[PDB]
Structure 1
Amino acid sequence: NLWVTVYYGVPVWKDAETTLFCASDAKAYETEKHNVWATHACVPTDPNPQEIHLENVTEEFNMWKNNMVEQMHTDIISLWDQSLKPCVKLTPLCVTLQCTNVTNNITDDGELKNCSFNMTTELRDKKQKVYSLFYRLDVVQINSNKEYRLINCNTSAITQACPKVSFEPIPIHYCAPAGFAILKCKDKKFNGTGPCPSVSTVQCTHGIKPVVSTQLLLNGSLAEEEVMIRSENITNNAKNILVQFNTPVQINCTRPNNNTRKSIRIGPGQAFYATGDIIGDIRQAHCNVSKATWNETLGKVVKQLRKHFGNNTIIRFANSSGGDLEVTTHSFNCGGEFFYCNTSGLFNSTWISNNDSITLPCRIKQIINMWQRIGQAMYAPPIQGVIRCVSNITGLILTRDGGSTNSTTETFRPGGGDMRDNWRSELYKYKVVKIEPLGVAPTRCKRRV
């Protein structure tokens, strides 16, 4: 006759969620510079990131309902303002601006303006007459010479992230406390849904740069064997679809203009870092990508789509549809500055079944509302000189078209813009559970009288 018997510390866990915590290691912590991007209070990473494998455990993984993303989504926004609050508020910068088409010899059909405006000084009585050079996307005109005003003036209070704090993405390892853990799904071909064959537990993730970017993923994790195709539901065109490379892709992003930073005193303790006149040749931002590995990438990809879609079909690439500039173009911070690039010729293709490189135009925008939250904007101070950043492309986000013509051709374009998809890139293999160390199972045992 069986009884009940209690066992403490049994390998029984249940699925739950709680608050996690960052690990930036120690090396990007030394970047300092008065709170470079994230790392300030961040906990160090484990020197030996112990990864323990569990056997005979069939665990069902979902990256799309994974809660660790929404946390990462909010922290980056809060940490963003945590920089801007001690930083310089640019709310007084909303002013009538007398600007001119920038100095060049014709051959246009500008976008840079020599902007003279009446400003204020640290001494509250006396005022300031200054000039600065602004990109066309941060201002708008108002209706003698044309007058201009900032774009955020009628929307949200503008601040400026002080030049000490940087935007540079720093690898972050999210960790879990006791009574909980993190599970890493290591199986090579994994679509992110359903059960996960390879289940291993860790207390912290790998290095994850919270890259603030759109249309392209940089510096992240690479896939294995075939390039993996992951989507929550592929029958819905609206749901975004994420990909992971087995081969990293090189890109060289540059701002070729040699900038000057004019620091003007709005204080005491306040001040504004303006843009000075370009020194020498007038060029424009751009990034280069190899066309050869690119063409082969689309060939290795199109062979992977023909497992899920058709054995032999047609695949066409076309440029984007419409939306905010943060979607329709590629956003990211290159070292101090936020670039917005035209992506067209990458996606000029039509594929069916069976030496040089490329180049893309780019634009820089300083005032940024990113994550769209109104009432508070931010201004990115200009960085002195030629900016260069090299990135490695580990991931993608795409959407599909619509019924069109029956079993004819499917078209694909860029997509996303919700940064929750950015964090799904490194979190696809992760999820959280909770331990139930108490258990009751029968046996012939019985306690005393």
Structure 2
Amino acid sequence: NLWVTVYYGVPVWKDAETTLFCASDHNVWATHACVPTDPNPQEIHLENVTEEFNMWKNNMVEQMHEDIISLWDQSLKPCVKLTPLCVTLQCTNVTNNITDDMRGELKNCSFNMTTELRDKKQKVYSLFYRLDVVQINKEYRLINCNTSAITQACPKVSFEPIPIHYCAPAGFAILKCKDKKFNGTGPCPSVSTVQCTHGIKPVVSTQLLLNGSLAEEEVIIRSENITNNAKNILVQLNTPVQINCTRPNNNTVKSIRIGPGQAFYYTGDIIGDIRQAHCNVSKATWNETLGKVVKQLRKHFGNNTIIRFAQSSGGDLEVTTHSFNCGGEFFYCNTSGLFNSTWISSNDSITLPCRIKQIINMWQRIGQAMYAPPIQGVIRCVSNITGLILTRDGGSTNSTTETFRPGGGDMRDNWRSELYKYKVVKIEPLGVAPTRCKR
């Protein structure tokens, strides 16, 4: 003979999707628009709570993706349009002081540019990197004058990633998985509750993930479905591999007015000789890293199978090559020097040649191009490789040899890689249970 008793403040929850807001602490991400952070953020351990996580169905990724794109675009609104640049260019090769690796990489183009006054014209000479220039028939045009408008990125706004914290609204909570070696889809036996995520840097790259989180103990291999060759494999490393990238040519940057308060920046000249951009990966470190990756792959593919790595399969430069933003320049580095080996049961460096491109089309969109102003001087950056994106090279008639190639291009994978440990739930404080209390 029991009665219903109503309780409010009951510690239960349901899976939920909601709007998360940005918290943070002259940048693309407009971090001044984000909520100041708590210097002493909370995290509480939940004893005896097991919660299912699924990183592949995690809406937080989708929402982060949309926010990054929107911030990107807002930051290009108050900038110079380069419409006046879609003219016929008269171009010759830059061959004075070059190495052979750069032969045919740069072109010296002249054109009739507008001036502050609309009844005047000026002759301008500038250098281009070839990837940005296409022949029309010495007559060239910028590569995108038949598909998109070009906006010059503002020279005062940094492209250096700044950590972003995602925060739940009141009534919601973010659960975090603390289970070391968690792969992203099973039940997580050890969880905690947090107010906001840790800071995540929106680093943009393909193939090799840079400046992310490391695995706690061992390389962790995660995929939506490991036996489905149509899926990407995200490999989280348990130690960084250092990569050193440079653009060695000393660039002199010039600026002209093309309109009423509208300046255009371009490479004027090069001091010293002309050499290619490149990245260095320590060779011994890279070989140890692959050995760890191969060992973990064997656990899913079989006893004494053969694992080989191969270069990318082809297609657009943006996915066949390792793209990244270093010093503000956009690099496209060839990784065939890394993914070329067969694994069956010193202190030199691996040099990866790189190309530089100024007309950029991010997020795989068409119709919105950006022009990256050249940067004065010589560029060097050092970064950590914290993970890989790999794909299986189709299937086979039980050949017993598996092949993996670098993959990427879908930005949601980079963010999924960092957000894999978080889940959003809705708090449901009201509930009932029987007892002996009547009224």
For the aligned pair, the TM-score class normalised by the smaller chain equals over 0.9
Deviations 1:7-35 (A, max 9, x none): 1110011111111122332xxxxxxxx33
Aligned 8 A contact 2:173 2:194 in 1? yes
Offset at residue 201 of structure 1 (A):
1.1
1:96, CA displacement in angstroms? Answer: 0.6
- Structure 2: how far apart are the matches of 1:272 and 1:95? 15
Q: Distance in 1 between matches of 2:209 and 2:143?
A: 28
Deviation of 1:79 after TM superposition, in Å, equals 0.8
Listed one character per residue, the Cα deviations across residues 401-428 of structure 1 (whole Å, up to 9, x for unaligned) are 2232314200001112010001011101
Q: Shift of residue 354 of structure 1?
A: 21
Distance in 2 between residues matched to 1:404 and 1:35, nearest whole Å: 48
Deviation for aligned residue 1:138: 0.9
State whether structure 2 residue 335 is matched by structure 1 residue 359: no
Kept after mapping to 1: 8 A contact 2:165/2:197: yes
Contact 1:37–1:168, Cα closer than 8 Å, also in 2? no
Q: How big is each residue's C-alpha offset from its partner over 1:94-143, in whole Å with a ceiling of 9 and x where there is no partner?
A: 1111111113368748221111000101111111110010011111011x
Residue 345 of structure 1, CA deviation: 1.4
2:165/2:198 contact within 8 Å kept: yes
Q: Provide closer, same or farther for how the CA distance between residues 101 and 194 of structure 1 changes in structure 2, counting only shifts above 3 A.
A: same
Equivalent residue of 1:271, what SS? strand
> Does the 8 Å contact 1:38/1:169 carry over to 2?
no
Question: Between Structure 1 and Structure 2, how many residues are aligned?
Answer: 436
- 1:336-355 pair list within 5 angstroms: 336-353=328-345, 355=347
Conserved 8 A contact 1:36-1:164: no
Deviates more, 1:44-53 or 1:316-325: 44-53
Change (3 A) 1:439 1:126: same
Superposition RMSD on alpha carbons, in Å?
A: 1.8
SS at match of 1:174: strand
204-213 vs 16-25, greater mean Cα deviation: 16-25
1:193-227 CA distances to partner (integer Å, 9 max, x unpaired)?
A: 02112111111111211001111111110001121
TM-aligned CA deviation for residue 38 of structure 1: 4.0
8 Å contact from structure 1 (residues 223, 246) kept in 2: yes
Shift in CA distance, 289/106, structure 1 to aligned 2, threshold 3 Å = closer
Task: Quote the offset at 1:267 in angstroms.
Answer: 2.4
- The verdict on how the C-alpha distance between 1:379 and 1:8 changes in structure 2, with shifts beyond 3 A counting, is same
Residue equivalent to 1:49: 41
Aligned partners of 1:118 and 1:129 also within 8 Å: yes
Aligned equivalents of 1:271 and 1:187: distance in 2?
53
Return the alpha-carbon distance in structure 1 between the equivalents of residues 91 and 346 of structure 2.
Answer: 55
Instruction: Find the residue that maps to 1:266 and give its secondary structure.
Output: strand
- Asked whether the 8 Å contact 1:38–1:170 carries over to 2, the reply is no
Q: After superposition, what is the alpha-carbon deviation per residue over 1:350-377, rounded to whole angstroms, capped at 9, x for unaligned?
A: 0011931211000111111111222211
User: Aligned partners of 1:240, 1:393: CA distance in 2, in Å?
Assistant: 18
What SS does the corresponding residue of 1:295 show, helix, strand or coil? helix
- 1:325-352 CA-to-partner distances (Å, cap 9, x unmatched) read 1100111111211100111111110001
- Would you say the 8 A contact 2:229–2:395 is kept in 1? no
Aligned counterparts of 1:166 and 1:85: Cα–Cα separation in 2: 15
Distance in 2, Cα, partners of 1:108 & 1:407: 42
% identical aligned pairs: 98
Structure 1 residues 37 and 167, CA gap change in structure 2 (3 angstroms): farther
Q: Would the alpha carbon gap of residues 354 and 125 (structure 1) be closer, same or farther in structure 2, given more than 3 Å must change?
A: closer
Contact 1:337 1:382 in 2 (8 A): yes
Instruction: Structure 2: state its 5+ residue gaps.
Output: none
Question: Residue 46 of structure 1: CA displacement?
Answer: 2.3
- Asked whether the 8 Å contact 1:183–1:202 carries over to 2, the reply is yes
Structure whose residues are more often strand by fraction? 2
Q: Per-residue displacement from partner, 1:283-331 (whole Å, max 9, x unpaired)? A: 1111101011111111122222222221222110110002211100111
Report the 3-state secondary structure (helix = DSSP H, G, I; strand = E; otherwise coil) of the residue aligned with 1:299: helix
Between stretches 432-441 and 191-200, larger displacement belongs to 191-200
Is the partner of 1:386 in helix, strand or coil? strand
Q: 1:37 to 1:386 in 2, by over 3 A?
A: farther
Query: Aligned-pair distance for 1:281?
Result: 1.9
CA distance in 1, matches of 2:211, 2:385: 6
- Superposed CA deviations along residues 219-277 of structure 1, whole A, max 9, x for unmatched, are 11000112111111111111111011110110111110111121110121211111121
Q: What SS class does the counterpart of residue 297 from structure 2 fall into?
A: helix
Quote the offset at 1:45 in angstroms. Answer: 2.6
**Deviations, residues 56-104 of structure 1 (Å, cap 9, x unaligned):** 2111001111011111111111111111110111122111111111133
Residue 6 of structure 1 contacts residue 439 of structure 1 at CA under 8 Å; is this kept in 2?
A: yes
Whole-Å separation in 2 of the counterparts to 1:366 and 1:3: 73
CA distance in 1, matches of 2:279, 2:421: 31
CA distance in 2, matches of 1:182, 1:106: 55
- Whole-Å separation in 1 of the counterparts to 2:346 and 2:173: 47
Q: Is 1:106 equivalent to 2:98 in the alignment?
A: yes
Take 1:210 and 1:233, find their aligned partners in 2: how far apart are those partners? Answer: 26
Q: Distance in 2 between matches of 1:117 and 1:231?
A: 51
**Offset, 1:437:** 0.4
Residue 209 to residue 326, structure 1, CA distance change in 2 (3 Å):
same
When residues 341 and 77 of structure 1 are mapped into structure 2, their CA distance, relative to the original with a 3 A threshold, is same
The partner residue of 1:183 within 170, 175, 191 is 175
Partners of 1:240 and 1:424 in 2: CA distance: 12
Distance 1:272 1:279, change over 3 A: same
Range that drifts further, 352-361 or 50-59 = 352-361
Check conservation: 2:107, 2:127, Cα contact below 8 A.
Answer: yes
1:372 counterpart = 2:364: yes
Contact 2:361–2:369 at 8 Å: present in 1 too?
A: yes
Residues 242, 53 of structure 1: alpha-carbon distance in 2 compared, 3 angstrom cutoff: same
Q: Report the TM-score when normalising by structure 2.
A: 0.96
- C-alpha change, 1:221 and 1:105, in structure 2 (3 Å) is closer
TM-score in terms of structure 1 length: 0.94
Structure 2 distance, partners of 1:105, 1:170, is: 39
CA distance in 2, matches of 1:229, 1:49: 30
* Counterpart secondary structure, 2:271: coil
